[PDB]
Amino acid sequence: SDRVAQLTIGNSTITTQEAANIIVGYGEWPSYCSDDDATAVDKPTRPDVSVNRFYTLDTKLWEKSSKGWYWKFPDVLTETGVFGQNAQFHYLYRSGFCIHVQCNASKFHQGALLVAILPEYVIGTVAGGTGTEDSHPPYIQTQPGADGFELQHPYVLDAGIPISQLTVCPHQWINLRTNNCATIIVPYMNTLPFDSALNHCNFGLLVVPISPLDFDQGATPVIPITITLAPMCSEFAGLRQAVTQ
Amino acid sequence: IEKKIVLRNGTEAFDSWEKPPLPVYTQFYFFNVTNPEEILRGETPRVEEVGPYTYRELRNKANIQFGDNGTTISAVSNKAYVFERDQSVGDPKIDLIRTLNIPVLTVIEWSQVHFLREIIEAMLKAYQQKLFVTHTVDELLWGYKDEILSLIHVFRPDISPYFGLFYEKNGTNDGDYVFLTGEDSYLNFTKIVEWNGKTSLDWWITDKCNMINGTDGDSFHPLITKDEVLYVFPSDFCRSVYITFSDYESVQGLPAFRYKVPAEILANTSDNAGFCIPEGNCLGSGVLNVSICKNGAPIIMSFPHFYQADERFVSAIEGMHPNQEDHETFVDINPLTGIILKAAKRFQINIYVKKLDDFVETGDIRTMVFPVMYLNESVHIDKETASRLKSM
Ligand SMILES: *[C@@H]1O[C@H](CO)[C@@H](O[C@@H]2O[C@H](CO)[C@@H](O[C@@H]3O[C@H](CO[C@H]4O[C@H](CO[C@H]5O[C@H](CO)[C@@H](O)[C@H](O)[C@@H]5O[C@H]5O[C@H](CO)[C@@H](O)[C@H](O)[C@@H]5O)[C@@H](O)[C@H](O[C@H]5O[C@H](CO)[C@@H](O)[C@H](O)[C@@H]5O[C@H]5O[C@H](CO)[C@@H](O)[C@H](O)[C@@H]5O)[C@@H]4O)[C@@H](O)[C@H](O[C@H]4O[C@H](CO)[C@@H](O)[C@H](O)[C@@H]4O[C@H]4O[C@H](CO)[C@@H](O)[C@H](O)[C@@H]4O[C@H]4O[C@H](CO)[C@@H](O)[C@H](O)[C@@H]4O)[C@@H]3O)[C@H](O)[C@H]2NC(C)=O)[C@H](O)[C@H]1NC(C)=O
Ligand SMILES: *[C@@H]1O[C@H](CO)[C@@H](O[C@@H]2O[C@H](CO)[C@@H](O[C@@H]3O[C@H](CO[C@H]4O[C@H](CO)[C@@H](O)[C@H](O)[C@@H]4O)[C@@H](O)[C@H](O[C@H]4O[C@H](CO)[C@@H](O)[C@H](O)[C@@H]4O)[C@@H]3O)[C@H](O)[C@H]2NC(C)=O)[C@H](O)[C@H]1NC(C)=O
Ligand SMILES: *[C@@H]1O[C@H](CO)[C@@H](O[C@@H]2O[C@H](CO)[C@@H](O[C@@H]3O[C@H](CO)[C@@H](O)[C@H](O[C@H]4O[C@H](CO)[C@@H](O)[C@H](O)[C@@H]4O)[C@@H]3O)[C@H](O)[C@H]2NC(C)=O)[C@H](O)[C@H]1NC(C)=O
Ligand SMILES: *[C@@H]1O[C@H](CO)[C@@H](O[C@@H]2O[C@H](CO)[C@@H](O[C@@H]3O[C@H](CO)[C@@H](O)[C@H](O)[C@@H]3O)[C@H](O)[C@H]2NC(C)=O)[C@H](O)[C@H]1NC(C)=O
Numbered sequence: 311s312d313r314v315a316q317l318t319i320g321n322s323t324i325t326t327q328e329a330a331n332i333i334v335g336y337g338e339w340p341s342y343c344s345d346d347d348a349t350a351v352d353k354p355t356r357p358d359v360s361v362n363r364f365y366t367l368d369t370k371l372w373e374k375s376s377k378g379w380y381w382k383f384p385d386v387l388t389e390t391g392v393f394g395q396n397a398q399f400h401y402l403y404r405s406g407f408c409i410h411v412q413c414n415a416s417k418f419h420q421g422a423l424l425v426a427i428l429p430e431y432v433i434g435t436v437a438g439g440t441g442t443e444d445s446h447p448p449y450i451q452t453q454p455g456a457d458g459f460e461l462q463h464p465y466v467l468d469a470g471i472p473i474s475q476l477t478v479c480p481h482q483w484i485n486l487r488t489n490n491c492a493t494i495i496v497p498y499m500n501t502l503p504f505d506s507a508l509n510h511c512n513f514g515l516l517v518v519p520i521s522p523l524d525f526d527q528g529a530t531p532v533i534p535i536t537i538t539l540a541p542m543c544s545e546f547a548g549l550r551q552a553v554t555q
Numbered sequence: 556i557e558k559k560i561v562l563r564n565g566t567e568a569f570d571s572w573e574k575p576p577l578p579v580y581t582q583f584y585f586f587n588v589t590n591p592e593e594i595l596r597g598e599t600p601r602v603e604e605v606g607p608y609t610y611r612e613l614r615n616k617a618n619i620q621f622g623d624n625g626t627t628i629s630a631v632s633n634k635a636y637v638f639e640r641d642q643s644v645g646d647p648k649i650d651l652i653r654t655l656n657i658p659v660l661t662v663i664e665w666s667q668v669h670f671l672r673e674i675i676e677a678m679l680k681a682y683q684q685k686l687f688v689t690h691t692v693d694e695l696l697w698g699y700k701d702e703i704l705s706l707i708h709v710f711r712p713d714i715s716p717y718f719g720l721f722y723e724k725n726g727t728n729d730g731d732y733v734f735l736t737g738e739d740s741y742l743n744f745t746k747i748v749e750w751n752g753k754t755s756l757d758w759w760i761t762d763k764c765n766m767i768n769g770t771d772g773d774s775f776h777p778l779i780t781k782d783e784v785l786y787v788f789p790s791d792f793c794r795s796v797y798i799t800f801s802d803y804e805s806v807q808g809l810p811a812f813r814y815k816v817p818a819e820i821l822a823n824t825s826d827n828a829g830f831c832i833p834e835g836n837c838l839g840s841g842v843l844n845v846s847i848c849k850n851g852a853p854i855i856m857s858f859p860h861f862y863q864a865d866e867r868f869v870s871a872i873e874g875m876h877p878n879q880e881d882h883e884t885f886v887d888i889n890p891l892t893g894i895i896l897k898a899a900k901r902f903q904i905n906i907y908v909k910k911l912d913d914f915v916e917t918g919d920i921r922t923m924v925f926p927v928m929y930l931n932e933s934v935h936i937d938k939e940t941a942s943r944l945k946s947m
């Protein structure tokens with residue numbers, strides 16, 4: 311009654327029969343902006359079906375020597391579907407997300423992942439190596455899009471913060487002896503109630519193998535990791551022509 | 556006894572070798588791509604030989620140290636280039652040269668050896684680039700800030716974001732050389748014996764292929780015969796070459812044995828089978844993979860215009876017309892004194908291209924060898940100093 315689930319929203323459902331449990335980030339569901347909070351005076355659009363779908367984005371192969379990946383949300387979906395068309399026309403934006411990452415393996419493979427969220431995941435550099443040149447990260451390390459980006463130094467998460475206490479932020483583990491998926495429901499976290507969808511990326515989805523993959527030779531050596539996400543309770547405002555960046 | 560030509564502090568042969576008094580003239584020739592999009596569609600390329608770009612060189616020696624009771628000498632050989640304008644067609648800092656983009660073909664190579672694979676494959680995908688770019692002459696040859704190489708520098712701080720064909724070669728050395736002067740024997744005079752502490756090369760297949768022979772090519776040993784074989788190791792070609800006898804020449808008023816770089820340096824022989832890396836599968840005759848000794852750059856060293864090379868590469872590029880007189884490598888040596896009279900070092904820098912489906916900037920390009928640039932480095936002895944050597 312906990313191992314088996316089904317998440318239907320929009321026209322797309324996903325079934326899982328070896329889940330762990332759904333955690334709701336910071337204990338509350340995504341919701342619409344109340345009139346106590348809103349400052350924009352134009353009526354928002356709320357598509358309510360066409361953008362609240364599980365978008366399956368990409369597939370990272372996980373071998374025995376991987377480091378970890380990250381996806382900046384919502385810039386994984388400003389190139390995809392009716393979410394990517396409404397977020398490019400409209401200046402303002404708010405939504406929550408239901409984030410579901412699948413990674414199946416046999417009952418002989420082993421290894422654990424820490425799929426975790428963290429809001430305002432800013433990216434530092436190696437500062438020129440020795441630490442004296444103020445190098446800023448490029449635009450693709452900042453906002454990789456639906457392609458994702460691989461961590462260089464996952465012990466410090468490319469930001470000088472340790473991964474050992476990433477477990478404070480909303481997370482759950484995918485260890486291949488127990489579960490194969492990890493649902494994380496995230497509300498809209500930001501100070502101001504709407505923001506731009508092209509500039510500001512509210513959070514980043516860190517997916518790091520902490521305990522590495524291991525399997526005896528003869529088993530299937532290709533163990534993919536696919537993340538599917540669904541913008542919940544999304545609404546846009548401030549209509550103008552299409553910007554792409 | 557001609558012991559007058561030695562490298563002793565107190566001799567006039569050491570004065571010519573420490574400071575070469577005769578200028579060296581190098582003319583940089585380029586290839587301009589006329590149909591760049593049609594190569595991406597898969598058509599036959601059409602180029603244009605563009606020049607001349609006359610540089611006058613500067614030469615000296617630094618860090619000269621002796622040893623083993625005077626017979627072993629070790630110094631560096633700096634080389635600074637100064638452009639000459641009246642002997643060139645136009646101002647190089649305006650002259651736009653359209654060719655391949657060598658840094659974005661370098662970092663595709665790095666993805667093939669899994670050297671920063673997912674970092675570089677994120678660069679060329681989100682930042683769409685051009686296989687064919689157009690920069691000036693001084694940018695393409697003396698450093699220019701690349702887009703993608705400026706992004707690798709913040710991930711890896713060792714990578715220089717400035718690419719150039721001869722980048723950081725103005726006033727810098729090409730190794731810590733050590734030589735063998737003629738205090739013991741006049742057969743081995745200023746011969747390269749070791750390189751940066753290492754005895755010989757280390758990246759070739761066999762230990763016969765690794766052996767560094769001969770000199771750097773500045774001045775040779777005297778008493779040259781017609782039947783002996785001289786060996787030259789330039790630091791650009793990354794092996795030791797030899798030179799064969801050509802004909803009788805006449806430099807001003809002195810004897811000359813014209814020696815030329817033969818076709819059997821880069822031919823398809825059983826000796827040159829071991830210079831194709833890794834397993835002897837050669838791209839063709841007359842070409843050489845030198846991608847190891849340029850820090851991973853897909854460069855091919857060959858004669859200009861595929862001279863003494865395969866014909867199926869000549870017919871692949873419209874404009875390749877090699878001949879004997881204009882695109883060879885030769886040297887005029889005084890047979891009595893070993894002073895180089897008139898030389899011309901002509902070598903072509905090519906960039907290998909092939910259609911790879913994971914990089915959608917290559918279009919539909921054929922697997923071939925593409926012309927980029929070549930240069931005639933010429934040295935010449937004038938009228939007054941020729942008459943100084945007519946006495947001896
Ligand atoms: C001129 O000259 C120049 C110079 O030389 C040149 O260059 C060149 O090039 C070429 C071409 O490209 C090259 O080759 C290549 O290479 C490559 C690479 O390799 C490298 O790398 C690797 C990687 O690794 C990774 O992974 C692993 C697993 O796999 C792991 O373990 C590790 O750790 C790593 O990881 C990393 O990374 C990743 C990525 O992804 C990430 O993710 C992570 O994170 C991390 O970081 C490596 O490994 C290698 O290594 C090597 O070496 C060493 C030394 O030190 C050793 O120790 C080792 O062991 C190794 O060795 C081995 O291996 C190799 C392979 O690899 C071999 O070869 C050898 O022999 C031995 O055995 C390196 O470093 C590669 O890949 C390739 O290979 C391929 O190909 C071939 C032919 O071609 C074949 O034979 C093979 O087999 C392969 O195939 C494969 O692959 C493909 C693609 O990918 C596919 O498609 C197919 O299908 C296949 O697959 C299959 O099979 C397999 C088996 O193998 C299996 O598994 C699967 O499943 C399937 O079934 C090639 O080889 C080279 O390299 C270069 N060079 C150099 C020096 O390098 C040029 O070219 C010239 N030019 C002209 C014109 O020619
Ligand atoms: C460094 O190396 C470069 C080349 O790598 C040398 O530059 C070449 O020098 C030669 C000789 O000075 C030049 O050749 C000359 O070209 C003239 C024009 O040629 C064009 O037109 C003819 C038709 O007339 C075409 O067939 C040809 O393809 C060219 O498009 C010729 O008129 C000259 O002919 C003279 O010599 C021949 C030799 O047989 C005689 O028969 C003639 O009667 C006449 O006297 C001559 O062939 C060549 O153009 C130069 N190339 C470039 C790109 O400049 C450098 O000289 C060399 N050294 C230095 C210091 O840089
Ligand atoms: C190698 O080949 C390439 C293309 O095959 C060639 O590049 C082109 O050269 C032309 C001529 O220099 C460039 O055209 C110029 O562009 C500037 C910038 O806008 C214009 O201001 C220029 O206008 C002048 O045009 C006349 C002179 O040509 C004058 O009468 C007029 O009043 C203007 O002053 C001119 O159009 C062109 O931009 C490049 N193209 C690219 C993509 O770089 C290159 O020149 C060739 N190199 C050599 C050495 O031959
Ligand atoms: C550097 O110089 C050395 C010595 O001068 C070269 O080694 C020699 O290379 C020649 C190549 O012609 C070898 O000759 C061969 O002889 C056999 C018969 O023995 C003949 O059948 C072959 O056709 C070939 O001519 C010679 O054996 C070899 N000697 C040694 C000790 O290796 C070397 O090749 C030069 N390397 C470079 C990069 O210049």
Ligand SMILES: *[C@@H]1O[C@H](CO)[C@@H](O[C@@H]2O[C@H](CO)[C@@H](O)[C@H](O)[C@H]2NC(C)=O)[C@H](O)[C@H]1NC(C)=O
Pocket residue numbers: 635636637697725726
């Ligand atoms: C390479 O460096 C040399 C050494 O400075 C440069 O040559 C001098 O440049 C100065 C700059 O004003 C000028 O006085 C002359 O052009 C040169 N002087 C002498 C005495 O040679 C040269 O410009 C540099 N070349 C490149 C391509 O970088």
Ligand SMILES: *[C@@H]1O[C@H](CO)[C@@H](O[C@@H]2O[C@H](CO)[C@@H](O)[C@H](O)[C@H]2NC(C)=O)[C@H](O)[C@H]1NC(C)=O
Pocket residue numbers: 823837838839840
């Ligand atoms: C360079 O020489 C080698 C050695 O003969 C050639 O390799 C042979 O090529 C023929 C075809 O011409 C094949 O039938 C043989 O089986 C090959 N033998 C070996 C041992 O590889 C090579 O093809 C020549 N290069 C070129 C471009 O023709």
Ligand SMILES: *[C@@H]1O[C@H](CO)[C@@H](O)[C@H](O)[C@H]1NC(C)=O
Pocket residue numbers: 564619
């Ligand atoms: C050459 O000249 C004299 C000879 O003793 C010496 O003082 C000088 O230092 C020598 N130069 C070098 C570079 O060794």
Ligand SMILES: *[C@@H]1O[C@H](CO)[C@@H](O)[C@H](O)[C@H]1NC(C)=O
Pocket residue numbers: 735740742743746748
């Ligand atoms: C050079 O001089 C003679 C002639 O070959 C020889 O005895 C000597 O060992 C040679 N030295 C080197 C380093 O080649």
